[PDB]
Amino acid sequence: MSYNYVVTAQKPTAVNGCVTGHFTSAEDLNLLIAKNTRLEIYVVTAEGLRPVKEVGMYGKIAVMELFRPKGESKDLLFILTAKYNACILEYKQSGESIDIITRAHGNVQDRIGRPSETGIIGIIDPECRMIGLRLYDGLFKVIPLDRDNKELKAFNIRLEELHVIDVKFLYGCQAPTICFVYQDPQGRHVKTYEVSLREKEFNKGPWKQENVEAEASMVIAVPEPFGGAIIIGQESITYHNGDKYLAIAPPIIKQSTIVCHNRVDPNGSRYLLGDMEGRLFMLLLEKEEQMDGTVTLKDLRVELLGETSIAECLTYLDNGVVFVGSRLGDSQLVKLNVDSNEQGSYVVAMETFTNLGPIVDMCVVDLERQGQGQLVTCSGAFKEGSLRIIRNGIGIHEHASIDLPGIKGLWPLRSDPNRETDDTLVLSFVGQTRVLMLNGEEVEETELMGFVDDQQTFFCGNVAHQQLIQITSASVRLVSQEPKALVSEWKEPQAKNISVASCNSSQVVVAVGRALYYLQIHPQELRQISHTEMEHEVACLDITPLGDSNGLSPLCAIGLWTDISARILKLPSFELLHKEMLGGEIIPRSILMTTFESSHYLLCALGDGALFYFGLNIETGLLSDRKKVTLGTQPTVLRTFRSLSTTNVFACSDRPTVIYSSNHKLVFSNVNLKEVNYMCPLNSDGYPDSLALANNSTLTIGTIDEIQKLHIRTVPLYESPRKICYQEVSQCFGVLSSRIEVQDTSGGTTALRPSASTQALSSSVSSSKLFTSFGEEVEVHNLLIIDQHTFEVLHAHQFLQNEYALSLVSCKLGKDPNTYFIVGTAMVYPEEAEPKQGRIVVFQYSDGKLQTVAEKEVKGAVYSMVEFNGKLLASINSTVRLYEWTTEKELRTECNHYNNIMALYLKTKGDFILVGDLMRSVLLLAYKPMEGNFEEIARDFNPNWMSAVEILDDDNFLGAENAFNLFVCQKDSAATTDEERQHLQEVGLFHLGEFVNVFCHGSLVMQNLGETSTPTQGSVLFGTVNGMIGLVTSLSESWYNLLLDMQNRLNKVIKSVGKIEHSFWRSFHTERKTEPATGFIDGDLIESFLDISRPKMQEVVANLQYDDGSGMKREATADDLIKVVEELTRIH
Amino acid sequence: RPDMGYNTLANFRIEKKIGRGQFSEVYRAACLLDGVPVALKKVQIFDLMDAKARADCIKEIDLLKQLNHPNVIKYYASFIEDNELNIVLELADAGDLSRMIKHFKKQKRLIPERTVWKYFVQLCSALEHMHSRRVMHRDIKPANVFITATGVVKLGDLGLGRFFSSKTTAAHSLVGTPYYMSPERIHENGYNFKSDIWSLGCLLYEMAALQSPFYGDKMNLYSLCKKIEQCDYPPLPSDHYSEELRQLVNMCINPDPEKRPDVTYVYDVAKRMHACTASS
Amino acid sequence: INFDTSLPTSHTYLGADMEEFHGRTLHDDDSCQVIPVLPQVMMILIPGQTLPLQLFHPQEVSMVRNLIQKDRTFAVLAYSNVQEREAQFGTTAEIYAYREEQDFGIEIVKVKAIGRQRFKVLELRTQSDGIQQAKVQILPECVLPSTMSAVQLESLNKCQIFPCSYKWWQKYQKRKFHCANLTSWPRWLYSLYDAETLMDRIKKQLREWDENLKDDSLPSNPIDFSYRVAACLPIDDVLRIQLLKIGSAIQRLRCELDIMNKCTSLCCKQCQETEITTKNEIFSLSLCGPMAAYVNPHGYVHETLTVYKACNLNLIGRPSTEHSWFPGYAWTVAQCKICASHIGWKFTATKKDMSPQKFWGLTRSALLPTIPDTEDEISPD
């Protein structure tokens, strides 16, 4: 009954693996990346990092590595998913079709097994003959590399050792030896084996076990000539080759455990280390020993290089550049100059990949533009706390604002020979045309002698042959550059008037009355070379030069007032190039030939809001390309300015609709402007690459933003973000933060680094009187208040010592005129397992200060706080409690309800209450104001970890649970017996592939009625620990029946990377049971139906029976799907 | 079966027989769940009383269920099994009041005055308990006044035997001599709350003089009625008992029930008087 | 406390040792089974506990004889209301020790039973002979991976194995639940739903009741430690029912850990106000704990809780050795001061050398846990 639909509004941004090799061919330096399911292969070049390809990975990636077998001229790739789907890739490019085809694929999971505690480790044989994977404890999975085993068929070797921390294949061995450090009650020992395929078992290794550091963590198999293996722990590093043994005790590694390692030399003479905190360590090996030409170690010097972002997977790119992969920070790219030593660091940052994860709490809001959501999220962890202010659009920053009484026409003019910069921007009033001098900040209206003033400007610009054409609706009075005299004035022979003055780079063709003629700007003269009339009046005249030549326009497309059709004909003749069937009633408003990505395009923007997007042929003829994407519902105009070395044509309308093609298909990034009527580029000397926003309110000039899908901002906090809530009236945000402070021998705690809490403009410490060792860390929790414009921290509130803040709510309660910031602390002590004295504290932002105008003392710990229709519903410990905000400003408990579970989540709608604990004990309570007490309706219990929950509607409840899954719940109102009425049915199963932390109601698009409503109902968004912001919106029964019956029809044609089916990928995942996904629709797969090729769209639909409007219409062509699928893509 | 606990025969182990009335039999036994000594009272209602008489007997038994006092025999449970109403009480095997009265009679030594009031106040408290809850005894006598080695007095046989004998009034003359007959009972005027104190006065005189107020050798039931109606009993000695001892029994042993005072008057006298000889 | 706590576990009070069985029987999860039911069993049998029975009815002896050649598994219905024989859940129990004695010319068997699996009954049928056969649907023992498994970085996985225990327990949270900065919930909350931390807090209380060491006696498996605590908990029938339905042992430990916390005072079940004993006065006399199931000479158990000081009891009887459950100990019977129910006995040491001198033996079937102050008894999780 749920009938839902899930789409991705933002792909994952935090990486979980990063390698280097020669993937595309022999002579390439690839930098493969995999964030969560986005395998972003690159190519490293001196210019930087050049993207090549991104693929759709149907699975959660955890193991990735480039290995080159023998007989193969380029690196392959090993791909193993968290669902244990294993496939080995092969890059291939055939001219243009970059296809990452797969050599081998298969599943490598076994029936019974307990996944290990140290996770999953996958390593390959340096001779490229073994795949080493440790999936389950006490069992080693190895697969022989050969052409015969294309299915990755596996054989197993029983391990008599349960704990195995880190296992690595060894360098310099006749047979593949593995070296691993593993914990036993005796201690930590490093033991080896000789895995052999002939006997399908293990064998004795090159040496025995060794007693080593009590916190030995990982191995790093040093390559030849040294061989052996190096083992890094929390305290010291060691070398284990058998007879040889070296170990140094470095005092600067003691700060934190070393997690990430990388080899920056093909012979192992150096190594790159990185800890949890994200600082860089240089491990060097010295071959100073030379017995008789053979070299071995002498010392294991360790150096400190610099501080990077908190690192997960390091990688060395040539010329001392490293991609510092991160998960809870910003992925970086740093040059390791060896002579810098500017302050003690050999690290300077070059690049930064914006990372959305980890998202903890977010609020969909409208910062600037009403009616549209600009999602704000809390992202980062520890020192990398930041806010990801996502917005769906490409706005413009107007650097100028001059009031103009409805500017009806603007065009650049350059009355200055040898300038190469805009000088004049002549306007066009209803019956006048003011010419303005604008070199720097000048906005004065200076009229040239070569130009008239009592006319409506329709074409005022610059042409070659030392002639400046200022064409008005009356006549074309061509002016000069140096003398600025009227060389010629081609007037209408019958004193007629041109409806619009159209012109090219070297020719001007106007539409005088019902006839069209071409008048090129001859050198120091003006003449006409053609004269013809059309059947209907030329409402729109468009004669603009095509590519090349730059002296003539091969084709001109026009609109007929009495026909409302695209009339294309030759410029020096009258033979009709082509006629377009699309169009009627309302005449076209503007026509232009667009050359996006060297591809000819022509969108017919009408005066009623219809843009008949189409192509053109420069040589001869024209196409149809039937596609009309609504660029508004108001009169428009198509004006193109480059400003970026590309076409960049934007059609002004009541809403600003921008026409950009991503690679070869137009992506309508609907711009953010008040109301754009006409557009003209202001490329002045003081306005480089800028533009003039000509509106009906005030003529503005400025620089537009980039052509980006979702422009993401970021503001640094330098402390962990916990929660966020939007408060509209106070014009600010509220965020909970936890800066780690070091317990020194002073009785206080010093801040580690300056942060948002430390550097806030105002700080307050709580003074509540209602109720240690050196070197230890203690969290200090804060409420930070940050403005929505500049995101400056305005107040950092310091809680009591050892006080934990769990819940955030912003609302106005009861019958008061001011809204409140209310946070619930929870005093937790290391001795006390479950806290016993929380708190509820009232804040109200006003006059630049945060004050505690009210306070509440409680016995427990508060976990969730919603506003229940004017009254605050705080769930303390495991007793969901109500309140009533009184007139004395003091919370008073009204009703209580003691739960069989721990009231961790609270979601309310109308007069309902949703309660859940950390183990998926979803509870539904109904308030009865006719009695003043709570009640229970249905109570569903299931043992499984639950991340966050949200109510869809009065009947449907949605949550995110363990094992990267999404589920919905629904209570049937037709329960004939109360036993069924006491149960929450489940109908939603879905493997989201992510781990939600928060749900929020809203959308990032302009909320449009659509007259006939929309397929989707509601709009809820969910964040993630990686940043995969998505959207699930309920659907009708027949909408979901169509989409489901064609999503199954998609997968029979579109192929994935690894031949991983969609059924397997999306199916419900639990450690004990798997079930197909039902009651959900994948929007990312559904949106990918557009990019499929045309002849495949014929195989997709053959018996669909799409139409339901009085007739099945089983044919449903192909555009009927594009009618609905394109409609769907507009929700985000 | 522990599910009903004290409420089944299979839980109990019968040892011997300690009593045998006209209709009911009294046993001492224990239970193989706790072993607590008890008083099992088995009667055959199916052969002695009609259906109507059982409702009043059951309802009265329910009143005795709420009777909880250290000076009264505690009521454990009452149930029906094998067509028998089985009632389990607190067993008092240390003896009854009449045992020492005979013992002092054998010693031919008058019981000290201070000793008489020591336990008579305890019996008055027991009499106060069921009189406050509108329950009568009908069988107040030294026979069912038991004392342990601690000196604590309990009052047992709460008229259960006399409830089944209401249809055999003429049979009272063949089994023993009812020396504690009240004037309202012999005249068939019905039993009232003044009959208990009448027996108490006859009990109090017997505790002092070691004889019944209307005792007589070869004395017949007609002669018993004349003495009871005339209240002709030998006077108590004044040298061994004070005036208050003799005055108290005068009101209790009276032909007119209305003249006889309430239990609170007797109990208050019991508390004040006994405290005097405690320090004497 | 020199009682040699192994004695009550050996059940030397039943006579000669029973015949032991080595085979182990288990039913499949969610399977539909048919199992016999003992008509005269009313104990809420927590699996993982051994329950000794003595049978006197010939049908009971006939029933076990049939089961002796069979799988030796029978159900124990946890009657929420015992009067009408209504049962909604149950427990499948195996038999491993039995002994038949021809006492006084009749065949009497004394049998030890071990409970294995909780199950849901769907139909209650009674055969013509009077023996009850129950439809069985085994509840699956849900196993939960750690709450940090799905939100754990694959790089930090090498720090998740570890080598003044307070400083060590502080160092166990900060290195297993370090990834709490990714999710919305704090470090300390995540531990409250972690098995290896709940059993620590339970062991802390148990050491106040027993002088044993946790390493040997108290098990390490969260499933085992969940059933072990529940059986040896001095609780009534109702509080022990909710601990049988719970499927995941992570919930059961939180519920028991709350049962052991709030229920500081105890009262009789026929008074609901007469305090009898507390939780601090409980001390252990068996390897099973202070609680140890003994049977009365006529097939009738008496789970018993030995406490130092107990009140509101009146002493009845004389010290008789008879069948003293505590070897060397006589007893004096006590009953409730108000409701005249049988609370328990007061044992006295006949030998002055041995310890303890006096300890009260209270049957479990007449004690009611009760929160102090005035509030309803609620057990989260």
Ligand SMILES: CCN[C@@H]1CC[C@H]2CC[C@@H]1N2c1ccc2c(c1)C(=O)N([C@H]1CCC(=O)NC1=O)C2=O
């Ligand atoms: C079988 C005859 N018995 C005797 C005649 C009946 C009555 C009175 C004395 C004794 N008796 C008992 C009744 C019930 C029990 C015991 C004795 C007895 O000892 N127990 C328990 C509790 C004490 C203990 O530690 N071990 C037990 O077995 C009973 O349940």
